[PDB]
Amino acid sequence: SGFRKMAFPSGKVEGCMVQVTCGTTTLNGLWLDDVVYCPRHVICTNPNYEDLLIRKSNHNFLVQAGNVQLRVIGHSMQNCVLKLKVDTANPKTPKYKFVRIQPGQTFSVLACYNGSPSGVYQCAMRPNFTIKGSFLNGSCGSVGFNIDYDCVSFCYMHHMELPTGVHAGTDLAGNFYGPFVDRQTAQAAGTDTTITVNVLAWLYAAVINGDRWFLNRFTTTLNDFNLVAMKYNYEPLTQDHVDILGPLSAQTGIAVLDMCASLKELLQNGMNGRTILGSALLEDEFTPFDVVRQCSGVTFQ
Amino acid sequence: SGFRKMAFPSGKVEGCMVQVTCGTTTLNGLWLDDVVYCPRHVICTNPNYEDLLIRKSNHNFLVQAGNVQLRVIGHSMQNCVLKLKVDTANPKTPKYKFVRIQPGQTFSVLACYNGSPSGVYQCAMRPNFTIKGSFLNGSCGSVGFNIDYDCVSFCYMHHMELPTGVHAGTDLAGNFYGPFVDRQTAQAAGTDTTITVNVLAWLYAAVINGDRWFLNRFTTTLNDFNLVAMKYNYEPLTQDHVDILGPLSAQTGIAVLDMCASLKELLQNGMNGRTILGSALLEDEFTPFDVVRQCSGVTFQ
Ligand SMILES: *[C@H](O)[C@H](C[C@@H]1CCNC1=O)NC(=O)[C@H](CC(C)C)NC(=O)[C@@H](NC(=O)c1cc2ccccc2[nH]1)C(C)C
Numbered sequence A, B: 001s002g003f004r005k006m007a008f009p010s011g012k013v014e015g016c017m018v019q020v021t022c023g024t025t026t027l028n029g030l031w032l033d034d035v036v037y038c039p040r041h042v043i044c045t046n047p048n049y050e051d052l053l054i055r056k057s058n059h060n061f062l063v064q065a066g067n068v069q070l071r072v073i074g075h076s077m078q079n080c081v082l083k084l085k086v087d088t089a090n091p092k093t094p095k096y097k098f099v100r101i102q103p104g105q106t107f108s109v110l111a112c113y114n115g116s117p118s119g120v121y122q123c124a125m126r127p128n129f130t131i132k133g134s135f136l137n138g139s140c141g142s143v144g145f146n147i148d149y150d151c152v153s154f155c156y157m158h159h160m161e162l163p164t165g166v167h168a169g170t171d172l173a174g175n176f177y178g179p180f181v182d183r184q185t186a187q188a189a190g191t192d193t194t195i196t197v198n199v200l201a202w203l204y205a206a207v208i209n210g211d212r213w214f215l216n217r218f219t220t221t222l223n224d225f226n227l228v229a230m231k232y233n234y235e236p237l238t239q240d241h242v243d244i245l246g247p248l249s250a251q252t253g254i255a256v257l258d259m260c261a262s263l264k265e266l267l268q269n270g271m272n273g274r275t276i277l278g279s280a281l282l283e284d285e286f287t288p289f290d291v292v293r294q295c296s297g298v299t300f301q
């Protein structure tokens, strides 16, 4: 019992982090087989990255694998990430893949500086394609990831902080999530909605653990609920989301539309000095798979 | 910028998790050097552990480390912790200590099932010596820990769950935090109070990240603050604590008794639909060390 914000174990990723130095810039790299991945703006000092990358030589890239300096023997750019081929393959390379996640999904973040892990925490890909992270100067190149039995599905690499304090980044194939670019120019994050299907996973998790004050005996239709979601800046609820909330419904015996009626009252009336799972706000960075993982103890060998 | 409930890298601790089976109990063990630490109620089926234990043989203790079956060559009991001596030293053993934490201190918990890391999160030793975890059946043996440069400071092992859904356990020398015992009797947690110095630290961390709606130009005396603390179920504040919150005060240029006055008026008036650091509650699970280290980017080799 209990419900915490849980991060994946970070050991499989720690073994990959290295330090990338080029000029005045030191950031974090990700070393998988013989390739080291980093943010391309490590080669900056509104740039011209292509221009900037042909002026570099292999010997300008200093790669620390801890107490071991790595030798670069090639480079190339793939969108906003720098692929640095080095003469050694990482003995700690896990089974991995590169996936690009959808907004509303979550992932874990190993924050790194100078190549050494600082901490790990759990994030969601907001609907405005930002993430609310903890990143300081030097964290760039840190990555986000999920674990699938033995497989690290890397889904984020870190690049920048926006003026509101939220963060922006790219998949491991270099493509930014959302309309963000790797430049100190100004850009707005965009209006963040609330991930409705996740709030509803989180309530199912509350029922599973014995917070039940918010439940009622009213029911609603998807249309009459979604009417209310778009007044509170919640995200529209689809039948596909209703199908995903299935097993959670079946476990608790609370129909999805029934739980939708509880989110309506909570939305219109507030919470009234009570808490759900320790929070006094509706939590939306728990997908339905996250709730089931945690509320059933799925592990990752 | 940003502030998250951050956990320590759990890599050095994952290499230490193992299954420990005995009868039809299965739980996790911590394997440092050639001793495997686990909870003594693995030998359970109000017991007399003396009698239960004098009464197993080494071959009762199934100790699995992945696809490797460690032979137990001896055993012994230190309070509520079983020490399973085995023939193989763990090549992945890091520098470690066993330390006992004080109420208010924080740590990371690598939840585990069948010796397999499931996920990692951060916690506090409540002032009633409970913790608020996410533990399912089979999680016992999971450990709480801190990191200190390169050294793992194990401080907690899980044993049980109290009826209100909170968790209890021991240091690694076997001794329970708080007045709990490893029996299926009834114990109530006892009145929990809010870790005041931590709330103040969380407030500093809010200032350091720009959340500014709750501060004022009032001050108070450590006495008249603690007077109001006693009324809101808040731990008293010491000069020791004031000394401790110094560097945060020095960084923000807000005297500690000034932040006490801000807390005082958050407590008597509440937050009024506003949020601090994405929460509608005064969060008390960050130490001054937690805040400093995250708002500074301390890493770990
Ligand atoms: C790399 O480690 C670092 C990570 C930043 C630094 C501190 N916290 C972080 O998240 N990356 C950078 O410093 C970015 C540089 C690349 C070339 C983008 N920039 C930043 O994060 C800085 N701000 C911006 O660049 C910035 C301003 C702005 C306005 C509109 C839209 C986007 C946008 N980005 C921070 C440090 C101010």
Ligand SMILES: *[C@H](O)[C@H](C[C@@H]1CCNC1=O)NC(=O)[C@H](CC(C)C)NC(=O)[C@@H](NC(=O)c1cc2ccccc2[nH]1)C(C)C
Binding pocket: A001, B027, B041, B044, B135, B136, B137, B138, B139, B140, B141, B159, B160, B161, B162, B163, B167, B181, B182, B183, B184, B185, B186, B187, B188
């Ligand atoms: C070990 O994996 C397991 C972990 C529990 C199971 C569910 N959540 C957990 O953290 N430990 C146990 O099952 C404990 C057995 C030892 C011998 C204590 N017991 C429990 O945590 C159970 N609760 C109690 O038995 C219980 C309630 C209570 C109240 C007052 C005093 C003592 C006391 N024990 C769980 C299954 C409810």
